[PDB]
Amino acid sequence: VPHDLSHLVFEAGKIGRLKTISWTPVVAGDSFECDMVGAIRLSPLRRGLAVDSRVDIFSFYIPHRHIYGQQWINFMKDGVNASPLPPVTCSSGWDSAAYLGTIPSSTLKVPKFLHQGYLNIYNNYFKPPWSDDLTYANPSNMPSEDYKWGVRVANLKSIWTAPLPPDTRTSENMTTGTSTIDIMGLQAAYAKLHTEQERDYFMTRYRDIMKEFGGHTSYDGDNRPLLLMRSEFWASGYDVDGTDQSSLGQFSGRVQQTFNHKVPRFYVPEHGVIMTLAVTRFPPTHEMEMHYLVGKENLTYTDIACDPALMANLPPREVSLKEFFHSSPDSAKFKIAEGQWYRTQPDRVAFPYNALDGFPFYSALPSTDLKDRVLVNTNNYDEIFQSMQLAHWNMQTKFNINVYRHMPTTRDSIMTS
Amino acid sequence: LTYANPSNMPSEDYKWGVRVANLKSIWTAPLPPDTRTSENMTTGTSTIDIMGLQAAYAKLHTEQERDYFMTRYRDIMKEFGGHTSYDGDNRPLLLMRSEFWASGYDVDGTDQSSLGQFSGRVQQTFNHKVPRFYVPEHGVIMTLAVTRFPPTHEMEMHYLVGKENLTYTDIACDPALMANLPPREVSLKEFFHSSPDSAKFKIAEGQWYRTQPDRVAFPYNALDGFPFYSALPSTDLKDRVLVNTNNYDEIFQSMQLAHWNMQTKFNINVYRHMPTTRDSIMTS
């Protein structure tokens, strides 16, 4: 029978960090549907609105088996006298499970499926794909801010914000004879590099190298949380006009955004949790990014002509944060696709701006390091807001859930009978 | 409330009125505290009376019902398929009932210092209609108001997430189990993040699966202006159910008009068989 598991949510977090806003434990065989409707607000910013932030709300299903593996299987089999499922440990702070959208129990411990569940959802859909998994054991092992506000999500695809995989080959040797090459061996050489290149660029995931075989893999083959629903939108608001002697001609942008998310009814195969997370981000607009062709001094035929034959046939080009940013070290490199500068265009911000707080732009220079300079650098948004004890953004939503089960009943459980 | 005279009721009970009950939550509507978690049948040393046992169950049933639903005569009656006049149990007769949610709008500050700051203004037009009513005997008609906020605490945790080792009984939601064991005694500690292991209350098995607490991020519990429950519950059953008003003092600015004020025009109309204004002052 319909079980109304509705509840209110009073949220808040940083800019480019994934954070759990709601979770509902589900049992095997029940149908789950939710209607999440609220408003998203940003902290008051220092001037008028200039650029809308984009918001992504995700609802996933992670069965317990996925989390406890064989331990869970045995638990279900063993039944009533199964050994209790050991929760996970947390860090000394009421805001020490935040990322799990839950208050750490009185003993500072929490469900592993809440932890691993979360871990599994990031390492499978947010973490850059050449990147290493968050193999955190317990929330007491994750960085303070990773578990306060959540781990950093990736910046919105730019030219410099989506470099080619760093382990990307720029050459490939075939050991040849001293005065002869094997015309047939060469052929083969190319076949192998192909298979390698594909794995590097597109199939870094099993489920991915499979799909290109024309097959399919159940979220049960690779233990990946199942993405049930996804909502995306741009949050906006209005400016407030100051009207006293001193702040007459001054404004403060107020971002109030009504949003809604609908998770269509869903059949829960096994017992598990449904995680609903939010992520607020701004387009990667840096105040000092230059057009590659304008930042790289001598222009050769290969750079300026856009000869099809050329672009379509040479290795990825290794560039530095220096051919894209005005002061940046010659030393911080990344691999780009030849002619990439012709498939795109950076946003452009006049110098008059780079000295102004209140603009949701990237002031600072990138981060020499690949990873870090891709997964967004949240902190470079601290200067955009006024005062804030409600982080960068806060949310007030009413999670209207409806679960259809085969439950006892309230009176038949308390009725020894 | 067996108060004799208003000079006997607590200062604030008779200033602003007695405390009404919080809106039903999981922890805010515990099972009756006197609720039995077991029942013994005195058996023989090496035998039990199969027929006596049967009977044992019949009596406990009648007891359990009184405990959970029929704590009122008028109630133990109704389950007999009968009815009792408000005159049988001397209960005030509820003539009309209106319920609504009050709202308003925010006011935008616009000076140098409070530009980006707001103040919520709650103006709510309401109306209540008591349909014509035939007064059997002489008496008074009382009209009372009660303003409340949903019991949102800033530190309530999901039972399953606050109770450490999860057993098969807690996590599987086996119908057979939930539908057949005694009420579970829990503590303010399996629901609130600091709360004493010692403050108990009885919950229905699997109650954690029929419900969901509201959730408030820690960033909030340090913020005055939010009509939420900051403080921890009240170790005591009663007190921690009938709402803890005071935990709302911090939500308002300045106030010499309490927490809420009302301006209403009570349009009444009574049809009698009265003398008249001139025929009473007319000795005649």
Partner: peptide
């Protein structure tokens, strides 16, 4: 759905 809260009657 079905009832839940049981106090021992009606509580306003």
């Amino acid at each position: 759905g079905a009832r839940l809260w049981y106090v021992g009657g009606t509580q306003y």
